[PDB]
Structures are given as C-alpha cells and as structure tokens.
From a paper:
As part of tripartite multidrug efflux systems in Gram-negative bacteria, they span the entire cell envelope and export a broad variety of structurally and chemically unrelated toxic substrates. During drug efflux, AcrB undergoes a functional rotation where each of the three protomers sequentially cycles through the conformational states loose (L), tight (T) and open (O). Substrates can enter the PD through several channels and bind to the access pocket (AP) in the L state and the deep binding pocket (DBP) in the T state.
We substituted V612 in AcrB with F to mimic the sequence in the OqxB cluster and with a physicochemical similar (W) and different (N, A) residues. In contrast to wildtype AcrB, that crystallises in the LLL and LTO states, the V612F/W crystal structures were exclusively obtained in the TTT state. We thus hypothesised that the substitution impedes the formation of the L state and this in turn might play a role for the transport of L state-binding drugs such as erythromycin. As we anticipated that minocycline binding to the DBP might be a driver for the TTT conformation in the V612 variants, we solved the apo structures by X-ray crystallography. These also adopted the TTT state with an open, but empty DBP. Despite the high resolution of our AcrB V612F/W electron density maps (2.3 Å and 2.8 Å, respectively), no clearly assignable detergent (DDM) densities could be observed in the DBP. We therefore assumed that the crystallisation conditions might favour the crystal contacts leading to the TTT state for the AcrB variants. F/W612 appears to stabilise an open DBP even in the absence of a substrate, as the bulky side chain might mimic the binding of a small substrate. Moreover, the proximity of the bulky aromatic side chains in the hydrophobic cluster might introduce a steric hindrance for the rearrangements associated with the closing of the DBP required for the O and L state formations. Thus, the stabilisation of the T state DBP in its open form and impaired DBP closing are likely the reason behind the observed increased abundance of the T state on the expense of the L state in the V612F variant.
Author numbering:
A (entry chain B): 1 to 1032
B (entry chain B): 674 to 817
C (entry chain B): 50 to 145
D (entry chain B): 866 to 913
Write the structure that this text describes.
C-alpha cells in the first residue's frame, strides 16, 4: 500500500483531506460535555403526602409501591426513604448499559398497578417517575434588586414566565424549580370558626361548592328539534380568580339574616404550595432553576442557548428582577477544550524544534506538522461512528495518544532520511526501502496495541465506562495513525524531502550545526560500545532487571489507588446541620452567618452564596441546610490559599466555634453524578420482623464495635437521621361516638388545620393553580393550640378535642429508610489511613456477623461495584499478555522472539510509579491509562528494534551481536526524538497549576517519569533481552 | 402534511393578559397586515370567533335559604341540557353506555329552564328562578 | 360531555399540559379546547424521533394528571394515539 | 423553513469540495478537475 501512494501523491492527499473533512465535520456536530454517562442508570419514584408522618408515608405509600416493583429487567437494587415532610423517594438502580428508556417504562408500569391503592391525597399531588442518574447542566437563580418580591412572588413569576421556555430549549431534558407557582392560601382562624359553629370541614365544603367549573350543556344542542335557529353554550359556575372572590365565599347564613363569609374566618392571600425551603441568594429572597443536560446533547449549545433565552426576556421582567448564574459547566468545558488544544499545539511546535534539531531541515519538519493533524481531526469521525462524545475523558484520551501518534510520524520520516544518508538513494526510492523495513512491523504494532487498550474497554461498572472512553479514543486515533503511516506520510517523504549524500552525517557543518553532529556520531559510538560492554556479562544485566521488577512490585503495592482527582470548579458546598427539633428560624441564623463569613473573610474569592434553609443531604427538614458558594474566576483567585481546598479548610476550622450546631465545608467530587470519592457504603437490614427500635440498637452495637478498631475504620457513621420526639393525639372512639362526633370530621379538622389540605384548583391570571387550607401559624405552633380547635357534633354542638382526645409525647423516626423492600439503616465510613477499602469491608462484615439474630446486611453504591469488579484486572490483562504474545509471534514467526519485546513493560512503569510516588499522586484512572500509553511506546520501540535486528539476520546474513549492535544504532535517533518531544510536550502538564490541574498532573507526572525510564533504560535492556532469548 | 405553501403564525399571550386582549391584539395585526397587500395575501385566523353564550348564575345564599343543594342544581342542569353517562348495559351481549338527557322539546330555548325543578331538603320542588338568574354574554367556542 | 370551551381548558387541557415536560425531542405542543366538550393536544417531535418511545413518554406524563382530571372525563377515555400518519382508505356503509 | 434555510448553500458547498477532491484523485491533478467541474451550468441553464 505505501508504494501505491508514494507514486500517487495527490490520491493520498485526497484521502487525507477527506479524513480531515469527515473529522472536522465530526467536531462541529458532536455533543460536547464535561463527562459522559458513567453512573448506573436509576429511576426515581417521588411522591408527597401533605401533612404525613414518616410512618404514614411509608405504610400507605412506599411499601405499597415497593411491593409492586418486581418483574423488571436488569434491576440491581432498590432503596427508598420516607421522611416527615410527607415525601417519599424510591430509587431503582439498574445494570450498567441498561436502556434508560425501557427501565423507566417498566417501573412506571409497575408503579401504576399501585396508584389505585395509594391515598387520594398522594395521587392528587402527582406520583412522578424521572430518570435520576443525570446531573446538573447549569443552575439559574432569580433575584429582585428593588427587594419587592418574596421568594413566593419570584418563584411564581419564574414558574409562569420562565420555566417552560427553558425546558423547551433545544437540548434540555429536566428542569427543577426552587419554589412553586402561587397557590391560593386560606389561613383559617379557629376563634372565628368556633364563633360561627364551623369546622375546617365547612370551609372545605364551601370552597369546593363555590370554586367550581360546571358543565351545563348547550341551548339547541344535538339531538335537535326540527326548526331550531339558536345554538348557544350554557354557562354556569366558573372557578374563582381572585382573593376577593374567594373571601366572598358564603359559609353560613345567621338566624337573624347576617352572612358569614370566608374572609370572616380566615386570611385569603396568594402564597406558596409549601413553605419548607427558604432559599436566599447573598441573603436576598430568590428562586431559580436546576437545569439538567439531555442524553447526548451539546452542553455548549444548550447552555449558551438558555443564556440567550433569559437574555431575550430581560427587557420584559418586572422592575428589580435580575437573573444570576451561580453555577455553569460551560467555563470548565471551554477550559478543558482550551487546555487540551494548547497541549497538542505546543506538541507540534515541540516536534518542530525536535525534528529540526536532528534532521536539520524544514522539509522533514513539515511531515509531522501535517501528519498528527490528520490523525487528531479524523479520530473524531471514528468516535462519531461509534457514538462517543467530546468529553474530558475522550479529550484527554487524545493528548495521551501523542506519544503513539508522534512516533508514527518520526519512524517514517527518520527511516527515510536515514536510508538516504547511508545508501545515497534519491527521495523517491529510499522511501520504498525505508517503508519495506517497517511495513509488516507497523501492522504488527497496531495488532499489538489493540490487545493492550481493548481489554480495558471490557471493564465493568461505572469504572468500566470511564475506561471505555479512553480505550476507544486511543485505539481509534492509533488505528487511524498506523493507516496514516501507510498512505500519506510515504507520499510526503517521497515528494517533500531533498536528497542527502551517502555518508554525510552533517559533520562538515560550521557553527552550532557542526558541533552537534560530531558530538552525536561519537554519542552513537559511545552507546553502541556500551551495549557491547553490556553484552559481555548479560548474566549480570539480567540480575539487575529483577531489581526493577521487585522495585516496581514493591512500589505498586505501596502506592495508594484513588478514583479521579478533585478539581477547583469555581463552586463548593457547605452543610449546616442543626440538631433534632431545631426550628427553621434558628437554622437561618446559622445560615446567615455562613453567608456573612463568606461575604467578608473571603470577599476576594467568593462570588455568591446560594443559601437553602430547608434541605441538606441527610434529608429534608427544618433543622438542615445547604449553602452554595460560587467562587470568582480562577483568574482572580491566584495561588494556593485562594483555591477551593484552602478555602474549605479555613471554613471548616472557622465554623468549629459554632456551638449549638454542626457546620462543615467541603468540595464537590469530580464526577458530581456519582459522589463516590472513596470509603464504603453499608446497609444494615431488618431481615425479620424485628422493628425500628431493635434495628437501631443493633445498628448501635455495630457503630460502637467499629469505633474500637480505629486502625482500620475511620468515620464510621449513619447516613439517616435519629429518632425525634413526636406529639401523639389519641382519639377515644367510645367518647367520640357518645358525643356524636365523626372520626372523619375529627381527622380532617386536625390534618386540615395543622398539616394543610389541597382543596381544588383556581385560575390566577388565566393559569390553573392549587387552593390550600391551613391554620394561620398563630394557632398551629404549640401543643396547647389544640384547645383552640373545635369539631361539630351531630346534635350541632361544638366539641373540643379534650372531650374525645388525649395526648402524650413519644419518639419516632423522621426518616425511615428501606433497602430492597426491607427496613434498613445505611452506614457510611472509610478505611483508616494506609489500609485498603476492601479489607475495611471484611472487618465490617465480620463485625456485622456478630449482630443479633434477624439483622442482615449488604453493600450498595460504590461498595457494590467493587464487590462486582475486583477479579477483572488480573484476568483481563492476562488475556492482554496472551494476545500480544500471539501478535508478536505472528510478526516474527517465532514462539520465542516475542519475549524480547514482552520484557520492556517494567522499564517504563517503574519510572511511572517513581514519578508518581515522589510527587504525592495516586493509582487513579489517569495513571493507569497513562501507563498503557507509556508501555505502548516502550514496546513499539522494542518491536522496531527486534524487527530491525531480526531483518538483518534474515535477509542480509549478519551475526548475533552484529545485528544487535547494528540495529540498536539505526533505532537510536528515533527513540530519542520521540521521547524528547514527548517528555517536553508533557512537561507543561506536570507543572500545570490552577483550573484542571488534577487531570493534567495525573497524566503528566505518570507519563514524564515513565518515559524517562522507558527510554534511558530500554536502549540498554532491549538488546540484552534479544540476545539472552535468541541464545536460550 | 397539508403544507402546500404560505406561512403559519402563532400569536401568544405571554403575560396574563386575557382572551379579549389577545383578541384585540390579534385584530391590530390582522388590520395592519391588510394594509400591505403587496407582500401579504389572505392574512386570516384559523380559529373561531367569540359567540354569544347563556350564563345561569346561582344565588348561593338563596339556594341555602331554600335548602337546595348546589350539586343537585348543578346536575339537574347538566344532566338535562348537557347529557350524562350513567353506567353500562348489555345490548345483545355487548357492553354499551347508558345516557340521560332531556328530550329536545325542553332543552332548545332559554325559557325551557322554567320547566326544570330541583327538590329541596324540606321535600319541595323549586324552580331555578327561585335561586338562579341568567344573562347573555360572549365567549370562545374554541380556545387555542 | 356538556362542557364549555373554558371548562374543558381549565379542568382538562391546562392540567394535562402542565405535566408535559421532561420529554425527549419535543419540538412544540399545540392544543385546542372547543365547546363540543372536546380537547385535542398535539405534541410534535424532531424528525426521526422514535414514534414508539415518544408515545410512551407522553402517556406516562399524561397519566400523572389522570387522577387530577374530572371523573366525567376519565370515564370517556383519555386516548393517546400517533397522529402523523394518514388515511389508507375510507369505507362507507349505507342501507339501500 | 426557519430551521432549514442555511442548509443548501453549505451542503452543496461540501458537494463541490468533495467532487473536486474526487476528480483530483482520478486525474492526479489539482487543476485538471476544473475542466470537468465547469460543465454544471450547461445542463442546468437548459433545465431552468
């Protein structure tokens, strides 16, 4: 093939232009995103029961739904929680690669077999079923700068004049609002209600009667009498539309003839669906949205498009309204885009300076300046053909292939330039001999480099998806690289290079260009003499190779293995956890303090604080909170003390003075949609009918026995909440019957007043919203306000709860959890420093086996991936060893000559571990994938050294040490040009600081140090291996 | 696809403006478009125009005073003049619906409302005139 | 049965519409509420969208409102068909 | 149409460029293609 295109230089230019057309076409239209879909796909059912205790939500919604979640494909596990805000969240998680669409449908179908069995109050609130494994594209906030709009008002406006437009933008798939649209709110007053002998039942009945949309038919409708001229609709009651209309609802006519109006017993006012979340932005009332990225959509397109949408609307907002953007991925996506290209461009210049230093002409330097572009651009068309996206993982999978894409251009031009200066052939025929010496080896270089990266695309779980991103990007660029080294680069070597005379080693040049050729010719002389002097006692230099193998193995087992490094993303979280019982008002104080501190002590780094008094991550509740700190650009936050980690430490430390509470800051894990990070994830399970209490006691035993082994387990803790005092009102059924009081009237008097009640709908500026009845806070705050409420008996008398009820305080759960349909408590922790997570697990399991009879366990989340993915690495890379072995035996037609190539692996890796352990890095995914590219070039250099030394024996009749010392001479200059352009091209990634430094340093330090050793040592060890093997 | 040629415009109430106002605003555009016949021909709406409607308003205070249920009133009216599906029956061994409606004779003119009575709690028959009142108004036969 | 255009919109259409979000490849949604008591809501999608997957997602979101629709409407059947096809033939039936 | 008006000048532009590269591929020349590429109007004019 190379010869076909040497003589057709335009046909090969046509093909390389089309690879660039198909690959440039592939960049414009392909989805950009920070990552792809790594998390196993989950479906969440969510349901609300206004006014319900955690037990009620579980015993009338959760369990019902759960008991119907079977007969579903690829279901890994199901966890659910039932809190005391009346909310139920059931997450069903599935096998990796399950169809997110098919899973949602099957769930929905089984859910809907229980909908008829759910309470009506729950049905009316909406039992939603979304796809939960995605994560936030951006976050809009909305403030009013005149300060004339409750969060209620702003939320309504956002609900009525923003939310849909954004959710109809091209590429959006989910939008969540930080509030509700307005709700007509009747705030009952019990003093009045008793005055006129009325309960909240009368109110609710009036509202449903006087706020109604009645269908009344038509005058002159089908079927018609003959001779009819009029056809008109009959119109009757229409839903009320104003607080004024609502207040004018007639509840009762007095005996004298006076009217009892709704406004006579309650306070009508537009308000919210619920008041559980106060969301302040820099301590101002706010609303906003939590947008999400659609499956396979261009983050850049969508994100920009919204910003232009909001922009389109800003003229028309009410006075004061201001849109804010306290989070966006778009900057960090443009950053990573900018960072990878500004590393591939400096790699074309660093190969320009490297090529020009040895080959000393600009004609040769234009072939790798042209060759890498093609393989880069055209890998995108091969990734598009396989449905991959432009993501940090695929983008850094292309800077990690530089060593292999650049060697594929150096080995073609250097061998052409070498055959011309040693034999004296013209450019057109020296390329034919140069490319005959590396035709079958390059096809063998690719079949081997397949069997190295491809077994990693078969890894399982979330990890196996991360690996499937590099594995296909690299293999794609490399299969396109080896094809570019057989179509375009020999056509280029044959028409752009000028002749060199036989023997001219540039030793007759003056200036700086004379000195280097005379110092390198002797440097070639001194090296080939070393290899000789090394050959003398190869039995000595095989004993030193075993020190590299125990030094690596010793280094492999002491280097800690992480997942993916934490970046500074301009944003981070602080959690506020007041204790059990703490009113919203208290939690606000602490929250206002968190915002204050961030707006003074860190004014230079802090851009904004989005304070959410209502929900944390332990749960929702009046005692929890989350503050969202958005930092200024990384440009205005220079240094270490002005980057997230530093700021969080300062924070955690500064807040420890807070006495009546728990305030912690921390940083967002890299993959937000997985959290993971490290540690383990334990579930304690009531596998008999034991009970909440007993499961708690049993959870206690484990928590105490775990705190007595701090050597292995640190931070062993629960994730759920602790029992809280509750007020129980017990109805004496016999006393109620005796007085003529309905249990249903009693029950709704109580829950309507203290819990709230959705009654029906109304029209508010021509949109349908809900109407709710609740007591005005005055009479629903203390256990003694129950004496203010009365319930009307059949004889028509008003009766106080004290006449049929009694009360007492008790304890109960504010958050009942269930794991795979059984009661559970989820325990979180981490391995004490030094030990591995896996052995920490075995301790937990041992500890748990001791816990009382009935109490099972299991592992979820992370701990379920690893327990399902630990045996993969030794058996998949075993297959890798075997297939590359069969690829090398295929290239050298020998079951033994492969081994000489197969013995180069440690030489790079040892240096990679070294460079890693020195700097303070970890065995993370960027390390392991950088190892497979470091091994890929150190063995491709061994393939061309063993091919050049076995070709000298096979078709020229040279001896053993002759062919070895002759081949290592030919293959010296290319190994040096490659590894110099690759250590210097990777250098700015090793000294990389600021935005994106986790991913740059994790590839940089592992590739720079593993390339120092895969070139300095290999050159001395790959001739030894070829001799010890060829002689054995 | 229909398509053929021309254009397809949607005028949208992007505040809580109202049916009427959106209509007026639609009118302005339709008139200003008929003053440029050089560019735009046949500029027109696709929906329908407001039609007179008969509104029966129930005096809740008068109904309560007489002991007449709003639900009884409401279904007396809609069952009679609108129709009502009640339940199913078997017709030659297949299940079909059962509907109740007034015979056209008494559901054709606004004056046939005086023929309909609603029974109060005391057990008396009460005409709509004793708790209702009516008037003609305009409304949309097709809200888009 | 028996409803004025306003009633059909304020008790059926808007309810259903307010639940038609979180759906893939949705181009636009138009709907009409007439005085025959009928409601038609057309959701149109990107070209090449899966006619099966689109129907399912709609149905799923529709059904989160079914509990909030009037009983008179539920009993009549809230159907969800694929509307972009066209007539193969038309049979008529007379008695001579 | 508001979502499909820019397509024709840029898609047939790609068409010009790829056939140009196909003709340069057949005659091994970056200039001999143009002699083939200049026949388009001769038919089209008659079609109009």
């Amino acid at each position: 093939m190379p010869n076909f295109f040497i003589d057709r230089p335009i046909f090969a230019w046509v093909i390389a232009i089309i690879i660039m057309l198909a690959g440039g076409l592939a960049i414009l239209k392909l989805p950009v995103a920070q990552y792809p879909t790594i998390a196993p796909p989950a479906v969440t059912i969510s349901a609300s029961y206004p006014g319900a205790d955690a037990k009620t939500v579980q015993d009338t919604v959760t369990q019902v739904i759960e008991q119907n979640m079977n007969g579903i494909d690829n279901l890994m596990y199901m966890s659910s929680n039932s809190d005391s805000t009346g909310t139920v969240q059931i997450t069903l998680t599935f096998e990796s690669g399950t169809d997110a669409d098919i899973a949602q449908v099957q769930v929905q179908n089984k859910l809907q077999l229980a909908m008829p069995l759910l309470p009506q109050e729950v049905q009316q609130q909406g039992v939603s079923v979304e796809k939960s494994s995605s994560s936030f594209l951006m976050v809009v906030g909305v403030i009013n700068t005149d300060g004339t709009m409750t969060q209620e008002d702003i939320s309504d406006y956002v609900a009525a004049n923003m939310k849909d437009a954004i959710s109809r933008t091209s590429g959006v798939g989910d939008v969540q609002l930080f509030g509700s649209q307005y709700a007509m709110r009747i705030w009952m007053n019990p003093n009045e209600l008793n005055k006129f002998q009325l309960t909240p039942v009368d109110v609710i009945t009036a509202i449903k009667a006087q706020n109604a949309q009645v269908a009344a038919g038509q005058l002159g409708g089908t079927p018609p009498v003959k001779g009819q001229q009029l056809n008109a609709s009959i119109i009757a009651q229409t839903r009320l539309t104003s607080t004024e209309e609502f207040g004018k609802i007639l509840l009762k006519v007095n005996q004298d003839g006076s009217r009892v109006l709704l406004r006579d017993v309650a306070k009508i006012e537009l308000g919210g669906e619920n008041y559980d979340i106060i969301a302040e932005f820099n301590g101002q009332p706010a609303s906003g949205l939590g947008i999400k990225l659609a499956t396979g959509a261009n983050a850049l397109d969508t994100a920009a498009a919204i910003r232009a949408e909001l922009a389109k609307m800003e003229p028309f907002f009410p006075s004061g309204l201001k849109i804010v953007y306290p989070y966006d991925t778009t900057p960090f996506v443009k950053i990573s885009i900018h960072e990878v290209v500004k590393t591939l461009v400096e790699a074309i210049i660093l190969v320009f300076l490297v090529m020009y230093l040895f080959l000393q002409n600009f004609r040769a330097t234009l072939i790798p300046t042209i060759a890498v572009p093609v393989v880069l651009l055209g890998t995108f068309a091969v990734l598009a053909a396989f449905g991959f996206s432009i993501n940090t993982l695929t983008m850094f999978g292309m800077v990690l292939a530089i060593g292999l894409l650049v060697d594929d251009a150096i080995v073609v031009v250097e061998n052409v330039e070498r055959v011309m200066a040693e034999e004296g052939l013209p450019p057109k025929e020296a390329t034919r001999k140069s490319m005959g010496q590396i035709q079958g080896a390059l096809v063998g270089i690719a079949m081997v480099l397949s069997a190295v990266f491809v077994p990693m695309a078969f890894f399982g779980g979330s990890t196996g998806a991360i690996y499937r991103q590099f594995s296909i990007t690299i293999v794609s660029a490399m299969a396109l690289s080896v094809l570019v080294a057989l179509i375009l680069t020999p056509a280029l070597c044959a028409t752009m290079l000028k002749p060199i005379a036989k023997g001219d080693h540039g030793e007759g040049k003056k200036g700086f260009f004379g000195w280097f050729n005379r110092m390198f010719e002797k440097s070639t002389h001194h090296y080939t003499d070393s290899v000789g002097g090394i050959l003398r006692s190869t039995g000595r230099y095989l004993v030193l190779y075993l020190i590299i193998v125990v030094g690596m193995a010793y280094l492999f087992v002491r280097l800690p293995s992480s997942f993916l490094p934490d970046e500074d993303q301009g944003v981070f979280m602080t959690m506020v956890q007041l204790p059990a019982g703490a009113t919203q008002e208290r939690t606000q104080k602490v929250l206002n303090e968190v915002t204050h501190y961030y707006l003074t002590k860190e004014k230079n780094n802090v851009e904004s604080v989005f304070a959410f008094n209502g929900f944390g991550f332990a749960g929702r509740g009046q005692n929890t909170g989350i503050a969202f700190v958005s930092l200024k650009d990384w440009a205005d936050r220079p240094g270490e003390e002005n980057k997230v980690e530093a700021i969080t430490m300062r924070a955690t430390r500064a807040f420890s003075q807070i006495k009546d509470a728990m305030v912690f800051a921390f940083n967002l894990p890299a993959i937000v949609e997985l959290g993971t990070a490290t540690g383990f994830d334990f579930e304690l399970i009531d596998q008999a009918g034991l009970g909440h209490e007993k499961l708690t006691q049993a959870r206690n035993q484990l928590l105490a026995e775990a705190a007595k082994h701090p050597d292995m387990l640190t931070s062993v803790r629960p994730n759920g909440l602790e029992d809280t005092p509750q007020f129980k009102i017990d109805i004496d059924q016999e006393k109620a019957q005796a007085l003529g009081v309905s249990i249903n009237d009693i029950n709704t008097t109580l829950g309507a007043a203290w819990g709230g009640s959705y009654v029906n709908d109304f029209i508010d500026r021509g949109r349908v919203k809900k109407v709710y009845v609740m007591s005005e806070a005055k009479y629903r705050m203390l256990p003694d306000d129950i004496g203010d409420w009365y319930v009307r008996a059949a004889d028509g008398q008003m009766v106080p709860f004290s006449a049929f009820s009694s009360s007492r305080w008790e304890y109960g759960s504010p958050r009942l959890e269930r794991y795979n349909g059984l009661p559970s408590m989820e325990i979180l922790g981490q391995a004490a420093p030094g030990k591995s997570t896996g052995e920490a697990m075995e301790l937990m399991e041992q500890l748990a086996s001791k816990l009382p009879t009935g109490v099972g366990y299991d592992w979820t989340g992370m701990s379920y991936q690893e327990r399902l993915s630990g045996n993969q690495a030794p058996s998949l890379y075993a297959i890798s060893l075997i297939v590359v072995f069969l690829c090398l035996a295929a290239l050298y037609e020998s079951w033994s000559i492969p081994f000489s190539v197969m013995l180069v692996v440690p030489l790079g890796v040892i240096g990679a571990l070294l460079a890693a352990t020195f700097r303070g890095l970890t065995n993370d995914v960027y390390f392991q994938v950088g190892l497979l590219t470091t091994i890929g070039l150190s063995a491709k250099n061994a393939i061309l050294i063993v091919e050049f030394a076995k070709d000298l024996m096979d078709k020229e009749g040279k001896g053993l040490i002759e062919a070895t010392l002759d081949a290592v001479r030919m293959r010296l200059r290319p190994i040096l040009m490659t590894s110099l352009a690759f250590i210097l091209g990777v250098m700015p990634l090793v000294i990389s600081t600021g935005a994106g430094s986790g991913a740059q340093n994790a590839v940089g330090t592992g590739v720079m140090g593993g390339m120092v050793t895969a070139t300095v040592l290999a050159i001395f060890f790959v001739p030894v291996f070829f001799v010890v093997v060829r002689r054995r």
